[PDB]
Assembly symmetry: D2
Homo-oligomer: 265 residues x 4
């Protein structure tokens, strides 16, 4: 084996880490030395390959399918990690969904589902992990919020509500743990090119650009993101590694915004 | 009697006591017709209606549980039948539960989210189409300082109030080119039963039942003015938001908090 | 009339937002001292417009960048009308430039007028307000005090700083009858904005002021309409009223949705 | 072999406190560093040695950052000695505690000049080279006092708020380039700037008891009930200077033990 790395020995759980930002975070944590438990909504043929991709960085990697909207499955994910790898030390609440719709016709079940996954599941997971972190005197809770947790955007009422709520939750957890070795913080990405964003760009391309994905992508990006470029899953992962590292011991209850200038204007 | 909100039809949820009643009173004092609302009927409802009717406008009362979307709709339909379209919607009904995160009851978390955030979405969704048809509306969401900052042992409440503020922004952006605005009022501590219960808990835990000491300590921790905000002041902010001078106030917070968030 | 008998000073109230604020304060019953950088032939008519509401109106020319002239303005008010009870720090200027070529003198001027002059005036008025037990300090900030915009580095810095100042003054007075708050307008159609629109009209739109005005407004303001000087005045009256006794150290943003997105 | 290897950094006010901690962490991450203080001191060579312990090139230049000509001389000295300035850390700053009513006019002006305007001058001087090279980092050391207010610190809160507004504009003007501009907002760090305040409070209110004064000073504002360290602020600077921050633009990294969260 090689030299120890900044997070060597730490056990991380990243919810919704079979795709997009969650996978980028899992990869960056593993590259920084952490053991990692990956998670997706359902078992899929691709899980083995993803596990091996993350495990190529030499740490212990596991996978556990669990619907984060079901508190029993959240508990089963945490208990699986405890049995397979050990106490959960880094919890990354990342699993999330989007639904674009004006408020007047926003479906009730979609509103409830976005609240349940993008906000309440983070509460359940944090609640289940905090007692062990307090007993051990160390912890990291990293909540994947959004720029949409700091500002609003049209046709994203439920998502903006949930993400704003997740930031408020973050502050409270940080304050309740402020004199301990546990920190809680949120990362607020701007647009990152994942399926969650690709589906929106496809809707725009069909609606306004005759299917031209290129024009629709440039228009989608430039409406909101002054950099006129996407944030990458690797950059969000680097922010998670930063928050998890010793230099962030006194970063508490705050947002790390990685958004190409979106919230600055 | 030409008053700034004369004839406007207002619905204030959870307005049988506390801040909601203060808001109803100030809206009526400004000339609005007002529909009061409580979770269930009480013998004192006629007295509360009379209090609000002292300002010379049309007052109605409708019992409805804002956590039940069918009852939110019933409240809106009742208002339409009695007074006409809902022109001012004040989403105020709300609850609190103090607990550390580790032991926060799952049911209480869900209830605080349902009433303090999701009920506002349901009422706004039900009222917006009419406001768009009529070319005018006000949606006024009663958030809190706890929607802008965190406080220990209030995880569900801070989450819901932050979310209500995010919701406010989106509604305002979707209506920005119309005569409809949506904004939030963020009070600091107001001396209502929701706060008095907390002060009582602090008094028993830490001050041997002394309510004066407990009250001053409760206020001083958070509120630089060392005094309570009043229900009348919250009502005055609602009147300001509903007035013509606020036609271009959109998606923002009016914080009435004695300096809480300034530090 | 909620402000009847109160004595107000509005800096930079010979045009635009400041004049709208003075009008609204007078309508609410306040006596008002108007102020501009230097005397102008329209001063008499501006006093007359404000005086139409039956209160006492005065005018005093003073460069707010000169502390001695700020003190002269306060002293003139105290002689003519009485103790300053409502202070509106409004006088302000703009200069649009990329950071690299931003003139040093223009940076200094924007800081001096848009931030430091408010400190000087507040410092001069607070002792009387504390003695009386009541006061209102209303700082005219901007959305540019809460977010950034390209080519406005000095102005954004000064307006952010004015908001920070507002918070400190409010905390130092929080247990008194004195409040300090900031109003943060979005775009309002005043000469300060018209000069910017003219520059972009000449550069990009062939001099078409109407087309340029729309493009300028819609870049930043979701309402796709200007905020008015009357609306900013109404916010000032609200902050000066008894309903705002516990509004302290905060921002009243009147911006058509600019900061909400 | 390190993340900032080969980058040339200038840290204003790096002979003490947070600036020295930032210089040390940047050097540890592989950057060459130019140190700076208000004037020459007997300790300068020892400070150079501290930073040079990490195997990079280190230089020192005394310059009053309130004097635009001396800011330019610092930049040109760096260009001559080490090369183009690639990382600019605007850190030099001062404090003065006073109620608004009696706040001295000259102290207000001095705090604005150093804590806000000097950052503007240094940024203006450095941006053309960064644009020519297609890469840059401007890191402004703000404060929690740039996001909320505190009693008796009107000038400082105004300057720090202004520095954050400035940060946003610079970031927006460079958003489509490889130059980023951001601010770090520390809470209380036990430097001379804070030690002086605590000593004043101890004498005025706690009978000279520095333990009691420190506890009260921290407890009033900082929920962690502990100081942030200069090393942690330095780690935040390294993070902002690293490739993972290529798309962090116009924002604040708050390192404050929970101060702004409540
Ligand atoms: N893509 C973007 O631009 C931004 C995304 N985000 C946030 O980042 C997080 C990840 O999003 P993306 O990577 O973009 O999305 P994605 O769609 O690529 O991935 C979502 C992941 O969550 C999992 N997931 C979904 N529902 C689940 C459930 N009920 N239980 C367990 N897992 C579930 C999926 O299996 C997948 O692994 C989300 O919280 C999203 O809100 C935040 C800001 C910007
Ligand atoms: N009291 C305070 O210090 C502050 C309160 N607030 C907010 O103000 C609002 C009002 O609170 P308070 O007046 O303090 O509380 P309160 O307990 O005095 O009044 C709550 C009102 O809501 C009604 N209510 C409760 N559950 C309901 C339901 N399911 N459906 C309909 N009505 C229901 C009650 O009947 C009562 O009329 C809440 O949203 C609260 O979060 C915000 C900031 C500070
Ligand atoms: N117009 C807009 O869109 C916005 C304006 N503001 C602010 O509102 C305030 C007023 O601006 P506008 O009405 O737009 O501009 P304006 O140019 O119409 O009015 C400026 C006023 O300030 C006075 N003034 C200028 N320099 C002065 C000095 N050195 N001493 C004394 N008085 C002086 C002028 O004579 C004039 O009365 C400014 O602080 C500005 O930053 C804020 C947000 C938006
Ligand atoms: N100590 C604290 O708690 C916090 C400090 N800060 C900020 O951190 C920065 C560094 O402050 P500290 O390390 O705490 O103070 P310090 O007093 O320990 O260090 C000040 C440094 O700035 C230099 N300096 C002062 N005036 C100068 C001038 N005119 N030209 C050039 N250099 C000058 C000094 O020589 C010294 O190197 C300041 O901007 C301060 O506002 C921000 C948040 C918290």
């Amino acid at each position: 084996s090689g030299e120890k790395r900044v997070l060597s020995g730490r056990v991380a759980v990243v919810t919704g880490s079979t795709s997009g930002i969650g996978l980028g975070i899992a990869m960056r944590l593993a590259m920084a030395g952490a053991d990692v438990v990956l998670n997706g909504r359902r078992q899929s043929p691709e899980d083995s390959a993803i596990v091996e991709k993350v495990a190529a960085y030499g740490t212990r990697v596991r996978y556990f399918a669990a619907n984060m909207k079901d508190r029993a499955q959240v508990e089963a994910l945490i208990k699986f990690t405890e049995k397979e790898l050990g106490a959960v030390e880094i919890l990354v609440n990342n699993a999330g969904i989007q639904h674009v719709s004006p408020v007047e016709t926003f479906p009730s079940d979609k509103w409830d589902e976005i609240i349940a996954l993008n906000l309440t599941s983070a509460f359940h997971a944090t609640q289940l992990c905090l007692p062990s972190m307090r007993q051990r005197g160390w912890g990291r809770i990293i909540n994947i919020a959004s720029v949409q947790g700091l500002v609003g955007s049209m046709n994203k009422s439920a998502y903006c509500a949930a993400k704003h709520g997740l930031i408020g939750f973050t502050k409270v957890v940080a304050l309740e743990t402020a004199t301990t070795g546990i920190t809680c913080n949120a990362i607020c990405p701007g647009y990152v090119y994942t399926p969650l964003v690709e589906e929106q760009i496809k809707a725009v391309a069909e609606a306004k650009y005759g299917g031209d994905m290129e024009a629709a992508t440039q228009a989608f990006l430039c409406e909101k993101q002054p950099a006129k470029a996407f944030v990458t899953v690797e950059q969000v992962g680097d922010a998670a590694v930063f928050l998890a590292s010793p230099g962030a011991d006194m970063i508490r209850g705050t947002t790390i915004t990685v958004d190409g200038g979106w919230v600055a204007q």
